[model samples]
Target: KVEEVQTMCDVARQLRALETASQSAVAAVVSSAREASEAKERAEKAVERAKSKKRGVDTATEAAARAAAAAQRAETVVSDARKHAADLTAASKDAIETTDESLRLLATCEADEPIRTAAKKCTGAAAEVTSKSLESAFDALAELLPDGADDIREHGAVFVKGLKSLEDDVRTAGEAKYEAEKAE
Candidate 1:
């Protein structure tokens, strides 16, 4: 019955959507890290000014205020960066779980060899990157941001390649399923 295989089909559809969404999540995290890096740099400079013994007594209060303000702004930016990194981590975990479930459903559905093969390929690609490892990568990148743009780009490319493979494999699964259903 169509009901038997429909879950696999539906999951394949969802996996494709996750591919794009997860990509966006990573992009947001990278940009947030960039913002955080700039804010931290500015805050460091402000702190340096406040610490300088050269400050005149009349201007000391103003220097303290400026340094405190920069520190607060940097704190906000850093926190925002962490949120985005966490979001990407969650998105990665979701994608991994969804692919695993779809593969399980594919096994139970008596799908054709081609369909099963495509689904398995999708799962394999997804498994290459763990959500935990990705989160750590983002954290490290955030720590070295502004300077770590190259590293971020490299890791992002790897993530994108992983999802791109999933997208392609899932697309094939959906197509094979459609053809099989049509011929039925």
Candidate 2:
């Protein structure tokens, strides 16, 4: 009977030890989970910052595309202007020829003063090169915007929306993790 009582006492001590060890293990697990929660919150903030950066990158891409489009348009406009300039140059030269003959016939007519001055102005403008100036503008556009532009492709695609969705998904996951741990 003494031996049986001693065995019972030993079993009680061992059970108490086992209970303490289980509680400690649970404490450790809980501590680790709390730390993970904090890390999740920090990662959430980092993801938000990344989202902001994504917005800027998206804007930069769009701006690049617009700049390229504008360059192409400027080149087209300059080409059209060059043709118009050539036309104006021809018109100016022809106008002066007609005015010169009429003025020489009545070089001192009452109408001569204003018409001669106008002819002199036309003659001065006749030598300017319109096509060359337009070509220069077109060349400048080419320098600013090139063909097979990789930048255009990047700009054409929308970035912020997808990044935002991913960020939200991560954030939602973090929240769910927190809730799960809290319930435990």
Candidate 3:
């Protein structure tokens, strides 16, 4: 009966050890599962952040490209305006020279004083017309200049000064022509 009791006690101890081991294993598995879930959540959040940053980068890049294109177009417009202004200047110069030559020819002609007076008047009118045309052209070019375009503002100011100078020169020349003819 004592041997029987000892065997039964040993069996009970073994069963208790197995039960403890099973509980420990189950706890370890539960802890591991919780850690994995937290790590997955962290990884997902990081991915979302990266995606948001990428979208912002893309939008910024597109905006920069559009700005560059607009600047290029503005530059082209300025260039064309400059070319037109130069052409107008050349034409005005040629017209003034032609008027001077015509007046010289009239002085050589044996025409009446009234004819000479008419010729002078015509020359004055031509000069005035030329001056007004140049002024208008400069105004148009100024309008074409882009708002807030720093590159053209200084140069545009120079252009305006030059146009004013041309206008003054035309007026001075017209007055001189009239005085010379009146003296005769």
Candidate 4:
């Protein structure tokens, strides 16, 4: 009867040790599972953050590209404006030169008193009446007259011819200037 009691006691002790070890193992497993779940959640959040950052980067890149294109367009417009301004300056200078030449030619004809007097008399007259009667009549008479008339006639002819040639030159220069501006 004592041997039977001893065997029973040994069996009970072994059973209790086994139950304690099982509980410890179960607690370790639960702790590990919770840690793994928290790690997975953190990983998912990191992925979402990375995706958001990538989207922001993409949006910024597109905006930068648009800004660069706009800047290029603005530069092109400014270049074209500068070119047009240069052409206008050149045209104005050519016109001024033609006007100076016209003035120089007119100065040569100022020596004749009769032509000057007649021009003064005809000032503010009707254009048609001036053209029909008084126009160039004194000049013709001066050309036919003798002494000192030769110099007057020569200078008058030069003045008229120079004015006509200057007109033609101005017209040609103006056309060229117009074409250059249009091309720009």
- Maximum-lDDT candidate: 1
- Taken over the whole model, the C-alpha lDDT of each candidate is 0.46, 0.36, 0.39, 0.36
lDDT of 1: 0.46
- Give lDDT tens digits, candidate 4, residues 20-46: 332333343333333333433444454
| Candidate 2 error regions (>4 Å) | 1-55, 108-184
Tell me how far the alpha carbon of residue 50 in candidate 4 is from the true structure, in angstroms, after superposition: 12
Candidate 4 colliding pairs:
none
Task: Give the clashing residue pairs of candidate 2, or none.
Answer: none
Ranking by TM-score: 1, 3, 2, 4
> Which wins on lDDT, candidate 1 or candidate 4?
1
Task: Report the number of the highest-TM-score candidate.
Answer: 1
The candidate 1 region of ten consecutive residues with least summed lDDT is 175-184
- Report the candidate with higher TM-score, 2 versus 3: 3
lDDT of 1 by residue, 56-157 (tens): 533544544444444344444444444544454454575557646856776656677766655555432222243344444444443455576666446544
Give each model a TM-score: 0.33, 0.30, 0.30, 0.26
What is candidate 2's lDDT per residue for 1-184, written digit by digit as tens?
Answer: 2232222222222222322332333343344444445544444454456568775555444433443343333333333433433443343344335434543444344544554444233222222222233233233323344673344223212222222222333334344444433422
Residue 62 lDDT, candidate 3, scale 0-100: 44
For candidate 3, write residues 146-175 as lDDT tens digits.
473444334334434444443443333333
Off by over 4 Å in 3: 1-61, 123-184
